[PDB]
């Protein structure tokens, strides 16, 4: 590929010149540990009845969720040092890194069964069976729908099943620009030479841009309010409409791009649309990296694991594998423990905003109509900044808005996201808890007592042994979030290692890392160090009072807030060409 280049490819191709497919979209996940399947190459554990895993029956994901994850919603413990923006950035970031495609439901027409409707365990379905005396699904002939992720090698003969990452592993803001050339151009405004992204043509947000509408014949967003007829949005990642909080962050970065391309045009009139697009794309990409590694990741891992797994950056290394590990797709779902059961919306005074200031999540999923018709994104972003995240306690894992009522407005039955996570790890043949402990150099408990010591919680170690029988079988997500949080962090040691290691490779194996020599000039790097997420909010919204750094720690108004006039704006003076 190009002997020399300046901007990254959309697909991530040829970031590593010695292996041009590393980190590129639509490639199989890399495996930090060999896959563990029931039959050794494809069938997930729990597929065939009576077939044990390490001498113990496989536990129903829904049962583990009922007995371990369920807790009384109203007793939720607020996090005194994490805003709800901390959770939301984790979701948006994840949508930059991994998306595991699944077969579309319509493929079941002249083949197999419809996993949306049927509870028959047949390819490509892997439905979650309902345990006895379930608190919500009292019919054991029912099930929670589940599609198996598409195999990396379709069909195939004796090929250990693996899964595909449809996104660029690099932290390159691909959730804004896309991971494939057709979508990338579809997202772009191709009617002039300004290098802008396409914006909505039917609706604005107090004079400011909204994401364009995507076209889905069976649009889930239209089901959330039939009279509004507001479809889902279009962005670099296809999940942009899952939540209005997520939508708001997509919309924010879309405005930031068009704001940068505008200034760069006035700054360099000779530049054409492509040049403006690529330059603004490169800044946004660096902004995501800065916010991620400077502000976000230290609050996920904590100082100890941060210094250990993300030492001081040196330079690019073309020997580093920058791909997303299959286990990271499940391990980075720790954020589900941070989810509050409501969407909070505030006004310019940071007070509850009418119509609805405390909407349960089960009525915001795919509710794009709320962004367009209930006040835009400013009330949402304000709620994300001035609302504490949910703290993860060993007996308060995840709320029921995602454990009982996930997508119930667009699904025949409410889904159980924690249970989906564990079923998903089995779908991907991920090794168990102790397998990843060892991989991370951590002690591996065999007995309830040793597990009790690891968790510093004899009670939880007991309920885990009752469900799983052996710590070797604890699904990686359940075990990851069950561990006590490290000092000033929000994950245990196991997830600190998996998450920390992943982002190390994404930094050291990225030739376009914003600090790597040649990417930016010295004056440009010093200019980018000044950016912050609160400043991006000031530049592209009607909000004039925003969190003070660190935004992910600030979470109470007016204690942790300042006026926008106090923060410095990004200085594009060094982007001037003679």
């Amino acid at each position: 590929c190009p002997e020399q280049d300046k901007y990254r490819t959309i697909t991530g191709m040829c970031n590593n010149r010695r292996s041009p497919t590393l980190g590129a979209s639509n490639r199989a996940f890399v495996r930090w540990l060999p896959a563990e399947y029931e039959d050794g190459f494809s069938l997930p554990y729990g597929w065939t009845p009576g077939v044990k895993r390490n001498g113990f029956p496989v536990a129903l994901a829904r049962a583990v969720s009922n007995e371990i994850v369920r807790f009384p919603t109203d007793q939720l413990t607020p996090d005194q040092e994490r805003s709800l923006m901390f959770m939301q950035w984790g979701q948006l970031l994840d949508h930059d890194l991994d998306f595991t495609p699944e077969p579309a439901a319509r493929a079941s027409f002249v083949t197999g069964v419809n996993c949306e409707t049927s509870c028959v365990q047949q390819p490509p379905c892997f439905p979650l069976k309902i345990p006895p005396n379930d608190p919500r699904i009292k019919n054991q002939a029912d099930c929670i729908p589940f599609f198996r992720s598409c195999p990396a090698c379709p069909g195939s003969n004796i090929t250990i099943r693996n899964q595909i990452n449809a996104l660029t592993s690099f932290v390159d803001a691909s959730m804004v620009y896309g991971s494939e050339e057709p979508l990338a151009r579809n997202l772009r405004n191709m009617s002039n030479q300004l290098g802008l992204l396409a914006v909505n043509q039917r609706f604005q947000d107090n004079g400011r841009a909204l994401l364009p509408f995507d076209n889905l014949h069976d649009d889930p967003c239209l089901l959330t309010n039939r009279s509004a007829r507001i479809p889902c949005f279009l962005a670099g990642d296809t999940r942009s409409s899952e939540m209005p909080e997520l939508t708001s962050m997509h919309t924010l970065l879309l405005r930031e791009h068009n704001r940068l391309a505008t200034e760069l045009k006035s700054l360099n009139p000779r530049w054409d649309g492509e040049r403006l697009y690529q330059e603004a794309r490169k800044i946004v990409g660096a902004m995501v990296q800065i916010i991620t590694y400077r502000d976000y990741l230290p609050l996920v891992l904590g100082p100890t694991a941060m210094r250990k797994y993300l030492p001081t950056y040196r330079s690019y290394n073309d020997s580093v594998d920058p791909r997303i590990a299959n286990v990271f797709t499940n391990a980075f779902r720790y954020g589900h423990t941070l989810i509050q059961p409501f969407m909070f919306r505030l006004d310019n005074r940071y007070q509850p905003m009418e119509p609805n200031p405390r909407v349960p999540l089960s009525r915001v999923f795919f509710a794009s109509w709320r962004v367009v018709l209930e006040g835009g994104i400013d009330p949402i972003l304000r709620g994300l900044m001035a609302t504490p995240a949910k703290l993860n306690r060993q007996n308060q894992i995840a709320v029921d808005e995602i454990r009982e009522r996930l997508f119930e407005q667009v699904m025949r039955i409410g889904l159980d996201l924690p249970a989906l996570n564990m079923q998903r790890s089995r779908d991907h043949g991920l090794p168990g808890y102790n397998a990843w402990r060892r991989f991370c150099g951590l002690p591996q408990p065999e007995t309830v007592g040793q597990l009790g010591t690891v968790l510093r919680n004899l009670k939880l170690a007991r309920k885990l042994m009752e469900q799983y029988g052996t710590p070797n079988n604890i699904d990686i997500w359940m075990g990851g979030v069950s561990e006590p949080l490290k000092r000033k962090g929000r994950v245990g040691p196991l997830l600190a290692c998996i998450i920390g290691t992943q982002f190390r490779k994404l930094r050291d194996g990225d030739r376009f890392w914003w600090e790597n020599e040649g990417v930016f000039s010295m004056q440009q790097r010093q200019a980018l160090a000044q950016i912050s997420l609160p400043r991006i909010i000031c530049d592209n919204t009607g909000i004039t009072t925003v969190s003070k750094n660190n935004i992910f720690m600030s979470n109470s108004y007016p204690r942790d807030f300042v006026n926008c006039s106090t923060l410095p704006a990004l200085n594009l003076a060094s982007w001037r060409e003679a």
Binding site: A105, F147, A166, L183, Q201, H217, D218, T238, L420
Partner: protein
């Protein structure tokens, strides 16, 4: 291809998009710069849409009202 999560179609790269109707408006704009319309026709051509008829008929096929 089709992007599907939990059976929901989140994106279908084969479907005409709503904001691409503003491009049709440019093409049918008599005063519109010709070099711009030529670039749009290359944009649509790269998607298998060659004549104005093909573009309109695709937008129609994908659920949009065409009165142009």
């Amino acid at each position: 291809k089709v992007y599907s999560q939990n059976g929901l179609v989140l994106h279908d790269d084969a479907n005409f998009l709503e904001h691409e109707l503003s491009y049709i408006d440019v093409l049918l704009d008599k005063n519109a710069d010709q070099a711009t319309k030529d670039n749009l026709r290359s944009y649509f051509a790269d998607k298998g849409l060659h004549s104005i008829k093909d573009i309109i008929n695709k937008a129609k096929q994908d659920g949009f009202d065409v009165s142009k």
